[PDB]
């Protein structure tokens, strides 16, 4: 019942591999739907072609800023921002998919994929999915990050959609 979406990842334009996610629409339907629709592009904008602008090995990969490409942009399917839906789910380990934000009730399109347990984010960022397949591809992406988050190669979502 929960939707599955994929990202095909490229590094400086060269294919790397595919990551798929489960979206916990059963627990966070509004937040899951935003990510799903941005992944299919069905509202006329979304993640295809955007990059992962911040990758910190041993912490997270952050993407979803499809308007400014650097962490200052993005928007939801519900407007610029939308509310924190709930905090049922927690940041329990690698593979968790969670919303980036800039304060209470400021979700847009930016998200991160945790590559470590990040329990200090519980109750502050909304968890809405997990990596299903291709965690090995996330681990490969992580190697292009650095302590300050700058990437040493351009990491893009070359294609994305729903499985």
């Amino acid at each position: 019942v929960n939707p599955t979406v994929f990202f095909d990842i490229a590094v400086d334009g060269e294919p790397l591999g595919r990551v798929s996610f489960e979206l916990f629409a059963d627990k966070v339907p509004k937040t899951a739907e935003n990510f799903r629709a941005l992944s299919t592009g069905e509202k006329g904008f979304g993640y295809k072609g955007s990059c992962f602008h911040r990758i910190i090995p041993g912490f997270m990969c952050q993407g979803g800023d499809f308007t400014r490409h650097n962490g200052t942009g993005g928007k939801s399917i519900y407007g610029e921002k939308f509310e924190d839906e709930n905090f049922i789910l927690k940041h329990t380990g690698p593979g968790i998919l969670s919303m980036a934000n800039a304060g209470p009730n400021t979700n847009g399109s930016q998200f991160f994929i945790c590559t470590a347990k990040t329990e200090w984010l519980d109750g502050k960022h909304v968890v809405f999915g997990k990596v299903k397949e291709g965690m090995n591809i996330v681990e490969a992406m992580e190697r292009f990050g650095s302590r300050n988050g700058k990437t040493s190669k351009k990491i893009t979502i070359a294609d994305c959609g729903q499985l």
Side-chain angles (χ1 to χ4, degrees):
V1 200
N2 279 341
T4 302
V5 293
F6 76 91
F7 290 174
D8 285 352
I9 304 297
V11 169
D12 280 351
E14 296 302 321
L16 179 65
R18 178 173 283 192
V19 183
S20 69
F21 307 99
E22 177 172 22
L23 314 179
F24 299 126
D26 58 337
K27 313 274 178 186
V28 277
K30 185 170 182 173
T31 301
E33 177 60 11
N34 182 59
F35 190 92
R36 190 201 61 78
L38 293 171
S39 296
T40 65
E42 66 195 64
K43 307 296 182 184
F45 50 92
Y47 295 136
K48 187 179 176 180
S50 68
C51 80
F52 281 82
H53 66 277
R54 187 175 198 247
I55 301 177
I56 301 164
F59 180 21
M60 63 160 68
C61 305
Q62 187 182 347
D65 180 357
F66 60 85
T67 66
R68 304 184 59 73
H69 327 293
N70 69 357
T72 66
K75 58 184 193 171
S76 82
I77 65 168
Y78 312 119
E80 184 172 290
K81 314 176 191 183
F82 78 100
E83 70 275 16
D84 296 315
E85 185 170 11
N86 64 58
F87 298 105
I88 298 170
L89 301 173
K90 313 298 179 188
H91 296 82
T92 52
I96 289 290
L97 184 60
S98 186
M99 290 304 287
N101 65 53
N105 304 296
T106 61
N107 298 281
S109 56
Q110 292 183 54
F111 63 86
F112 54 100
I113 307 168
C114 298
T115 52
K117 180 169 170 175
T118 59
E119 71 278 3
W120 59 90
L121 301 179
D122 291 344
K124 174 166 63 167
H125 295 265
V126 184
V127 171
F128 67 95
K130 76 174 208 74
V131 172
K132 181 183 180 192
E133 288 192 301
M135 189 65 202
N136 57 302
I137 297 303
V138 177
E139 296 171 330
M141 294 165 60
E142 197 177 17
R143 299 281 184 177
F144 298 102
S146 67
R147 289 288 308 276
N148 68 9
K150 179 209 103 294
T151 60
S152 54
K153 293 184 176 167
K154 194 60 157 184
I155 307 299
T156 56
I157 300 172
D159 197 11
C160 50
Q162 187 164 0
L163 295 177

